[PDB]
Amino acid sequence: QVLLLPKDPDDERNAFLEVRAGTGGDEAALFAGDLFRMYSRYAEARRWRVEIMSASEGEHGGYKE
RNA sequence: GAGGGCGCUUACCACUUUGUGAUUCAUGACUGGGGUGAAGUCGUAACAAGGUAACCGUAGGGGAACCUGCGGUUGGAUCA
Ligand SMILES: [Mg+2]
Ligand SMILES: [Mg+2]
Ligand SMILES: [Mg+2]
Ligand SMILES: [Mg+2]
Numbered sequence A: 001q002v003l004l005l006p007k008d009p010d011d012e013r014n015a016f017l018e019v020r021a022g023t024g025g026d027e028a029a030l031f032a033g034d035l036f037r038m039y040s041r042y043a044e045a046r047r048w049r050v051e052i053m054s055a056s057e058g059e060h061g062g063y064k065e
Numbered sequence B: 001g002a003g004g005g006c007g008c009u010u011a012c013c014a015c016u017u018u019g020u021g022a023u024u025c026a027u028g029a030c031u032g033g034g035g036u037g038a039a040g041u042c043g044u045a046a047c048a049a050g051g052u053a054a055c056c057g058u059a060g061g062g063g064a065a066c067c068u069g070c071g072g073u074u075g076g077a078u079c080a
């Protein structure tokens, strides 16, 4: 029942969280503004730095990338 | 002796070889389009007079649907 056997490289490194619109077009680019709101609020629960480097917005709102 | 056989020889002829051409299948850097997409970008050309009535031939032009010229057609509308 011992829990920490293996090692893990890359495991503490910072991420590049990319979110892209799938099927739906203007609405798949409108749920993508709610996955970014899912993880950017999760990264503030445990004190991380979101850094919006590139973002192209949808027509009716959200993010297409 | 006549005649036959063997040999030789010539004629026809299969193998095989050379030249060139047709044709069909495979393939080829690349390129012209075509078809299918439960989402993208740029427009809105068509269907209502679709907001420039559409369309046919042809010609020229333009990212693209197209647009314009000349002729034609009604498979156009409104005529108070
Ligand atoms: Mg139109
Ligand atoms: Mg117009
Ligand atoms: Mg018109
Ligand atoms: Mg027109």
Ligand SMILES: [Mg+2]
Binding pocket: B053, B054, B076
């Ligand atoms: Mg018409």
Ligand SMILES: [Mg+2]
Binding pocket: B061, B067, B068
């Ligand atoms: Mg012109």
